[PDB]
């Protein structure tokens, strides 16, 4: 196997600055067969560059790869709004045609604390015997956040999950939920049910709160 | 023109069969056709190749025992089995285009939508829709427990969009799913416009709209 490593992971830029994006090989790609995919959404990877320079029909000029051996490069001259996603690079001459592990690409903006929310569950799901509380971290930057939950003071572990939103179009934010799940029996054996949210926006943790009632 | 079009989504049980179409219309025996699978949240992994027109093939080592390509003239499509599927084998399966069988070495230019194959001892399952409760004010719903993905939340019928943020599903241990969508609305608003989040769980022919009351 040809493992390909790509670095960086994540590169944070303004639309307009320039990107390189290197994929090392662990031996020769021999003929220099090394393509250059771009992946934004679902959407199914989109070929950028074959034969390690070429680019593939209707890629704008922006897009440059070079390099040989077992060193590559994809360069973006001027970073458009649409270019930022995820790169992956992929030799296709040694079976299996690995591909890298991807950098991801993302819009650099200042930085934004996260507005929390929380969540009591409701008499719906209470009625079913689970309470799902929910912490809101809205509209935030960077991506890098820490979720607390505490029941009474109390640190939670292992009963919580969170996902994150894709960079929005319009402010470049991400937002994150994060649900805390216990069964009905342990929620109504405590009081203060809060969210602990760390961000290098915030000063100081962020705490929200509620008190079953 | 030219299109891939891939057979729709499955669930499976640990330890069944699944076998994937890609129907070639717009040109098969002509190119060479790959397959590349994609686990939610990882990068793509390369599985295979066939050369349509003489059946040659190659399969990734590892995962070569359990994957055949296969592809049949007559009917203008490829198949690719995959045999002993584990949880590990959950991914969405393209199947593509690289260059023709008589040109030189070519990456895929062309990609099919991919078969979202979902291998689970879960059975397929409509969600639960809880509201989350309300100057900005945040409210939601909370789409719990429903097997396999995908759903999709809209509010109001689509008529509210701003401030709308639908998070990627999260697997919970139960093996069912579950999902949150918020908005952001004046609180103003509150008990003067109505909040309805349009659910659609197309795998278990499930539509919930669930009101939202401060």
């Known amino acids: 196997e040809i493992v390909l490593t790509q670095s960086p992971g994540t590169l944070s830029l303004s639309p307009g600055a320039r990107a390189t994006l290197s994929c090392r090989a662990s031996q020769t790609v021999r003929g220099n067969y090394l393509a250059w995919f771009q992946q934004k959404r679902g959407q199914p990877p989109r070929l950028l560059i074959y034969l390690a320079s070429n680019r593939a029909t209707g890629i704008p000029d922006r897009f440059s790869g070079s390099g040989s051996g077992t060193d590559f490069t994809l360069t973006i001259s001027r970073l458009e709004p649409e270019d930022f996603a995820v790169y992956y690079c992929?030799?296709?001459?040694?079976?299996?045609?690995?591909f890298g592990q991807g950098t991801r690409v993302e819009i650099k903006r200042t930085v934004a604390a996260p507005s929390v929310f929380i969540f009591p569950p409701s008499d719906e799901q209470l009625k079913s015997g689970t309470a799902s509380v929910v912490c809101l971290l809205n509209n935030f930057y960077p991506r890098e956040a820490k979720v607390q939950w505490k029941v009474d003071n109390a640190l939670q572990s292992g009963n919580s999950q969170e996902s994150v939103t894709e960079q929005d179009s319009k402010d470049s934010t991400y937002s994150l939920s994060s649900t805390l799940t216990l069964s009905k029996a342990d929620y109504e054996k405590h009081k203060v049910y809060a969210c602990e949210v760390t961000h290098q926006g915030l000063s100081s943790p962020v705490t929200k709160s509620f008190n079953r009632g | 023109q030219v299109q891939l079009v891939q057979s729709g989504a499955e669930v499976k049980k640990p330890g069944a069969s699944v076998r994937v179409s890609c129907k070639a219309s717009?040109?098969?025996?002509?190119?060479?056709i790959q397959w590349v699978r994609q686990a939610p949240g990882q990068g793509p992994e390369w599985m295979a190749w066939?050369?349509?027109?003489?059946?040659?093939?190659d399969y990734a080592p590892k995962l070569q025992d359990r994957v055949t390509v296969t592809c049949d003239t007559s009917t203008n499509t490829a198949f690719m089995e995959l045999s002993r599927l584990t949880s590990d084998d959950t991914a969405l399966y393209y199947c593509?285009?690289?260059?023709?069988?008589?040109?030189?070495?070519?990456?895929?230019?062309?990609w099919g939508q991919g078969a979202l194959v979902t291998v689970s001892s879960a059975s397929t399952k409509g969600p639960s829709v809880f509201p989350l409760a309300p100057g900005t004010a945040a409210l939601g719903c909370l789409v719990k427990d429903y097997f396999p993905e995908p759903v999709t939340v809209s509010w109001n019928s689509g008529a509210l969009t701003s401030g709308v943020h639908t998070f990627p599903a999260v697997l919970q241990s139960s093996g069912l799913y579950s999902l949150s969508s918020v908005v952001t609305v004046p609180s103003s608003s509150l008990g003067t416009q109505t909040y309805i989040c349009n659910v659609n769980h197309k795998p278990s022919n499930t539509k919930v709209d669930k009101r939202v009351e401060p």
């Open positions: 717009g040109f098969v025996t002509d190119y060479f």
């Open positions: 593509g285009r690289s260059g023709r069988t008589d040109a030189r070495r070519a990456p895929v230019s062309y």
């Open positions: 066939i050369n349509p027109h003489n059946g040659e093939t």
């Open positions: 992929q030799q296709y001459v040694n079976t299996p045609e690995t």
